[PDB]
Amino acid sequence: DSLDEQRSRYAQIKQAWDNRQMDVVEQMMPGLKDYPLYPYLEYRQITDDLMNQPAVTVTNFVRANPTLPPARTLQSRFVNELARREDWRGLLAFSPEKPGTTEAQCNYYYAKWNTGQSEEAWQGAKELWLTGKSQPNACDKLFSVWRASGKQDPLAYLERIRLAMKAGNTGLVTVLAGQMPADYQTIASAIISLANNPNTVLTFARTTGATDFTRQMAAVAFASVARQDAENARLMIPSLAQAQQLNEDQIQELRDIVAWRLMGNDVTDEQAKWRDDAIMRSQSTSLIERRVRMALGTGDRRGLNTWLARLPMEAKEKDEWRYWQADLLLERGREAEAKEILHQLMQQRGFYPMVAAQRIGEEYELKIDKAPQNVDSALTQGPEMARVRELMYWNLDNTARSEWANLVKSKSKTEQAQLARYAFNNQWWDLSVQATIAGKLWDHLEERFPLAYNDLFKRYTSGKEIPQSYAMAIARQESAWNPKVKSPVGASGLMQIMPGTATHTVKMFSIPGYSSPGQLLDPETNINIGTSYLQYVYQQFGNNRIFSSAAYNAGPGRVRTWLGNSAGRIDAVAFVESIPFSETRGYVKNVLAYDAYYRYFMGDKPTLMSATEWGRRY
Ligand SMILES: CC(=O)N[C@H]1[C@H](O[C@H]2[C@H](O[C@H](C)C(=O)N[C@@H](C)C(=O)N[C@H](C)C(=O)O)[C@@H](NC(C)=O)[C@@H]3OC[C@H]2O3)O[C@H](CO)[C@@H](O)[C@@H]1O
């Protein structure tokens, strides 16, 4: 036998298994014991009949496979199965210690109650209870018996209502208030009315006794009101402060909430004056930073000087604010002071350090730390690495990511760098990036930005205007090179393409052969459709990477709106910094920095922006 022959038998047993040709599977299983992925076959077998599995079988499998990701998750999964059987005694015999998942934890504590360990059951219940998040259905029975015991502190009950409200979990706020303990029954209806409609906040505030609880509840609803109508909330502050006898800090929080909603282009002069007075009296760093961005996005020089100065000392340490301090100093004719800041920025890694270099006409120096010459360690020769090798061979990147996560975890920086280089050497691009992240190897640029799917990117950009380096930068930011990754919202593959976008792109470009979003997990298909849409927004916005990256992330419409706001009054850097969506702003910064890294590894000059992008009016 050989690894090569086992690979064929492995693919064949999975094929038979998928067809439920169990006679073939039973005959083939024994002959695959020496294949690295045999534990995955055993796991599938055990879970196939989990409802009839004795605990001893599960315990034995979990103990025999300590580094197998699914063996680790089987612990919590079986705890849930024992709960389903109502085998409380068995659950604790199988899992004497608190399990890993929340659902399993709910069942673990209910098992404790069922076996006479009430005090311990209550300690766990309270810990699972104190969250604004909706917990697993399994916890319902636990919270119920906990409350029925008389040991549930009513203050803890009211506290979860506060947490739920803050989390925006109004459905939970309502359910809790609907089952309100007698202690707080008098305000139950008011709370339900507040969660149902935040516009009842003034009524809520006036009809309930002002306490820390009602003040916090009202403050959350107030922010919901400000989001729907900033003026309505602005005008309500006096009455709310009087209704709840709010102190200075509490009144300022209300001012901050409204100020956040008056950052639009449509604000009146009265609203703008009120907003700026509120921000002047604020202690909120993020609010002041948003105001600075408003000055940057409108070309307001005096405003930039004023608001940058209002930032607390700590915020002024940030790369962006240091650059904008230098920008102000340059215009003031303080060359030496400004250029020393820019030179200090150039010594660091990132977007601004590269902007600093281009600003003063100096070539940016990439700091590249090399991994060790020898990457072969005990970690690269053990059984877990052998499983990683097989998983990657079958293109099971998500499954391999979990194995790799265990392998790089709790390792020295040296070992994590060797693992990154080992992955890099084997062209396991996503694993290479994953190891650099785990080890925080930020200056190991070669392993952080591998030339992944190079031939495909070249082929699919040769007929387009978007640079190959640019398409790769976008992919790097989107998927960290894992072709099988999907976001919570459904974005898929290397370029994180949404199903709707793929369909719309295929139609717009008359691309053949696309019939299912599942194909987005194929590297070539993903790169084909992704480079197509990227080229679309690129040409639509005049071959400008700031606009195309922002459009790829937030959509063409948002970019048009932002450009209508700045209206040709600002420069490239101010446009990037003033982007109002933090996700898109960070996305653009990362992509521009990554494109420079890719140009470098391709042998081109890594200048941050083209002369056209750098000099254009925004
Ligand atoms: C698969 C997916 O969800 N993709 C979305 C992508 O999400 C990234 C995102 O990465 C950010 C930039 C990050 O800082 N990640 C950490 C792990 C990191 O240290 N990165 C290093 C700088 C590096 O070298 O890469 C994170 N997501 C969020 C929501 O914050 C998270 O980490 C990796 C992925 O999940 O973000 C894109 C938008 O920026 C999105 O379009 C894409 O669907």
Side-chain angles (χ1 to χ4, degrees), residues 201-214:
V201 66
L202 190 49
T203 302
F204 171 91
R206 293 175 170 164
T207 66
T208 66
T211 62
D212 198 47
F213 174 75
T214 57

Side-chain angles (χ1 to χ4, degrees), residues 442 448 476-478 485 487 496 553 583 587 590 594:
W442 310 132
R448 294 189 61 216
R476 170 60 176 77
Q477 166 65 26
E478 293 291 4
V485 75
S487 71
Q496 288 289 279
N553 183 250
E583 175 187 336
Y587 182 98
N590 284 355
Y594 296 174

Side-chain angles (χ1 to χ4, degrees), residues 229-244:
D229 195 320
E231 183 64 8
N232 182 227
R234 190 182 72 90
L235 298 175
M236 188 195 300
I237 296 180
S239 292
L240 185 49
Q242 182 250 73
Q244 300 189 309

Side-chain angles (χ1 to χ4, degrees), residues 237-257:
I237 296 180
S239 292
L240 185 49
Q242 182 250 73
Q244 300 189 309
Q245 318 99 53
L246 302 182
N247 61 36
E248 295 307 312
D249 284 349
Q250 292 168 332
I251 302 179
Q252 187 53 43
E253 184 194 11
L254 299 182
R255 287 196 189 106
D256 290 352
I257 289 166

Side-chain angles (χ1 to χ4, degrees), residues 415-467:
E415 291 176 318
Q416 289 165 326
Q418 287 178 304
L419 289 171
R421 186 68 192 197
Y422 185 78
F424 179 88
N425 287 341
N426 283 284
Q427 298 197 348
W428 296 341
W429 313 127
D430 44 12
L431 301 190
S432 174
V433 177
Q434 188 183 345
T436 63
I437 291 172
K440 295 177 180 299
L441 309 169
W442 310 132
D443 294 313
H444 279 66
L445 300 187
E446 193 175 19
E447 294 73 33
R448 294 189 61 216
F449 303 96
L451 292 178
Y453 304 96
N454 189 73
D455 294 341
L456 286 171
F457 279 102
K458 183 177 179 188
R459 183 190 312 165
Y460 286 100
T461 56
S462 62
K464 304 179 177 61
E465 302 167 294
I466 49 168

